[PDB]
C-alpha cells in the first residue's frame, strides 16, 4: 500500500509540574537505550505527546544517547520550567534510521501555525 512520510520525531516540551514531569524512564545499563517505562496520567509529559513506549534521543536539540542513564535523566532535570524532549517510537525508529535525514530540527521546524498554544 501507500506509506506516509515516516520521518517525524515529535518534540515534546515538558513542563515542570509538581516536582518533575511525571514519567518513569527505563534505561539499559550501557549508554544508548533510554526508553519510557511508564507515564503518569496526571503529568505534563503525557499531554506533550510523550508515550509510555517511546525512546529519548535528544534533549533540547542535542543528542543524549551517548550519555549515561543518570546523565540522561539529569538532562531533563536540569531544566527549570520547560525542556524540549525529542521522542520517537522505537518501532518507527527502525524506519527513521534508514532515512537518516536532517529530521533533527530542520524537518521539525516546518511552517508556522499562529493561533493555538
Amino acid at each position: 500500500g501507500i506509506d506516509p512520510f515516516t520521518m517525524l520525531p515529535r518534540l515534546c516540551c515538558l513542563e515542570k509540574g509538581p516536582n518533575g514531569y511525571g514519567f518513569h524512564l527505563h534505561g539499559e545499563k550501557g549508554k544508548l537505550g533510554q526508553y519510557i517505562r511508564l507515564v503518569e496520567p496526571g503529568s505534563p509529559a503525557e499531554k506533550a505527546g510523550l508515550l509510555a513506549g517511546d525512546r529519548l534521543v535528544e534533549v533540547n536539540g542535542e543528542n543524549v544517547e551517548k550519555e549515561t542513564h543518570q546523565q540522561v535523566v539529569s538532562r531533563i532535570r536540569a531544566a527549570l520550567n520547560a525542556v524540549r524532549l525529542l521522542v520517537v517510537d522505537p518501532e518507527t525508529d527502525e524506519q527513521l534510521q534508514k532515512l537518516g535525514v536532517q529530521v533533527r530540527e530542520e524537518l521539525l521546524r516546518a511552517q508556522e501555525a499562529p493561533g493555538q498554544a
Binding site: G20, Y21, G22, H26, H69, I76
Partner: peptide, 5 residues
C-alpha cells in the same frame, strides 16, 4: 525500579 522524573 525504573527512574521517576
Amino acid at each position: 525500579q525504573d527512574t521517576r522524573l
